[PDB]
Amino acid sequence: ATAVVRCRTRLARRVVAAVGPDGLLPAPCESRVLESALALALLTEERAEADATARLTAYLRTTLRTAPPDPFQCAVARAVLGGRKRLMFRTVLAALGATGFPAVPWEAYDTRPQQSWLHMEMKALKVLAAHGTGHPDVVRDEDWRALLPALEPGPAWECNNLAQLLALLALRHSPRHRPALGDVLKHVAGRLRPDGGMPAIDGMTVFTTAAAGLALSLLPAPPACVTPMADALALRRNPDGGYGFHSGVAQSDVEDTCYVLEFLRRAAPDRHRTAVAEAEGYLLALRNPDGGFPTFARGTSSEIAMTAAAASALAHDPDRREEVDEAVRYVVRHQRPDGTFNATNAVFRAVLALTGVAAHGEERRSRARAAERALAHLAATQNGDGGWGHAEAEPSDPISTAYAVIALARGPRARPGGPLDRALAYLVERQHPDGGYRSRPDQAGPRPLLYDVPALADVFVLLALAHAT
Structure with a gap:
């Protein structure tokens, strides 16, 4: 024909x-720099999964050199290696030490519960901002409660590696949630792809x-x-x-x-x-x-x-x-x-x-x-x-x-x-x-x-x- x-x-x-x-x-889904960098930060702060941290590090260096993503993810990777959207992305960078935390009222981080992925991500970022600015007393019990699914074993809640990684970076600051942390870190490290990176989602x-x-x-x-x-x-x-x-x-x-x-x-x-x-x-x-x-x-x-x-x-x-x-x-x-x-x-x-x-x-x-x-x-x-x-x-x-x-x-x-x-x-x-x-x-x-x-x-x-x- x-x-x-x-x-x-x-x-x-x-x-x-x-x-x-x-x-x-x-x-x-292929490995992504944002989630790979957040996983590297998490495992490093917890002094965990040495083999996975070295593979994540080599993945980030390689990917910056040969196929760098958008500028935001590049800054995220360099941070770890060395409207509402703007608030999210700036707080991620500040959580990694790359910029100052936004000087916003804490209600800026509150989102509608039925946007359930964004809701958990923004609760996690609120907690990181409260601790990062030296006001841990600001966090209320309903903020921690929104993060509990990140402590469940197995694949990430809603197949969303970004939401689980941000939640765990927040939860490691809480003494009463840390007993659950060790086990999930094992599951997180087990997700690395053949190139050593973390995928954004399971598929x-x-x-x-x-x-x-x-x-x-x-x-x-x-x-x-x-x-x-x-x-x-x-x-x-x-x-x-x-x-x-x-x-x-x-x-x-x-x-x-x-x-x-x-x-x-x-x-x-x-x-x-x-x-x-x-x-x-x-x-x-x-x-x-x-x-x-x-x-x-x-x-x-x-x-x-x-x-x-x-x-x-x-x-x-x-x-x-x-x-x-x-x-x-x-x-x-x-x-x-x-x-x-x-x-x-x-x-x-x-x-x-x-x-x-x-x-x-x-x-x-x-x-x-x-x-x-x-x-x-x-x-x-x-x-x-x-x-x-x-x-x-x-x-x-x-x-x-x-x-x-x-x-x-x-x-x-x-x-x-x-x-x-x-x-x-x-x-x-x-x-x-x-x-x-x-x-x-x-x-x-x-x-x-x-x-x-x-x-x-x-x-x-x-x-x-x-x-x-």
Whole structure:
């Protein structure tokens, strides 16, 4: 056939091959400087795990020399080797001796409990700031109580190594929590990767399996493995009907749940009808009065990408027309004067909602105009090699390009030399001999700090090729 179809075929064979007999696509996360530096600080202050501390140290020196991350993580590493976001990051550096502690009232550190990861991280930072400024009396019992999960053995609570490491750095100052510290330090040291670093998270297998299942379910003849992958996802659903990003993550989120719902709707709508209905209920319970959807917790601000993803995922059931149209109207109202709302991810989400949801009359025209401007922004920012980078002046990467391809697949048909044609040729050219893709990562957490789940590059390119072919 075409070079594009041969590319899609080799990639689909690779993604299918990577799915295991348990139905999951493994998605380990690479070591990250921030968590590796915090682990080094913790083990060093506790004079523990000598072999792990030396490997962590060599990992940090190597990584600064050969592949340095963003400037914040570099300063964190050098500290250990030698709005609300600003408060968090400055307190981390101050905890490591790199800057002064923010001169803020202590209430600056208090956060809403349902943002449960951030809540524990900010309690830990409050405790470090209270001790670091010489006011340990400030810490109240409810501050310590929020940190208790960090003293449980096994993998980190919510798969979140940053939250556990910050909590332990705080807890080692408390005489009544120190009996539990020795055992967890053993578990922490046991997490080091082959390169000697600490990963940000245990993995992203739920997110990655769902997105791959969706991509596979969009092929002309989906492979048989979509059924065990649907099964593996549905038996991991949380009590509220939603999905966390990995096994063992109790905090459901909208983005994971939308990928699972979209996949299940295509691959197992009857076999998993109850899981489908429960994920729909999860999303509907989260919807804000303005018609948008938050990332995790209702009452928190609606976000464009989450609003667009939920609109698309809910559009299947005709009983939800009202909710879906309100969400798409929210997307139209929030388009920026340059057609926007990395750069290409939100455009992808918005364009699929703008063109997938059925509409006629004046609303059809309004949505069509919005999608045109978004696809025009993509055409205007396309790089000479046919790809897109994570911002307009950045070199191309396959994942940013994959997102743009999914959106452009909803525009006019590919013409030779046109933007979609050139983007597909870019992806064809970037396929590695083993059939896969290597890419700059685009997942962030805590925003804007990137972490690298390499399995996602193959999956998002496959999703793009499946949409575009």
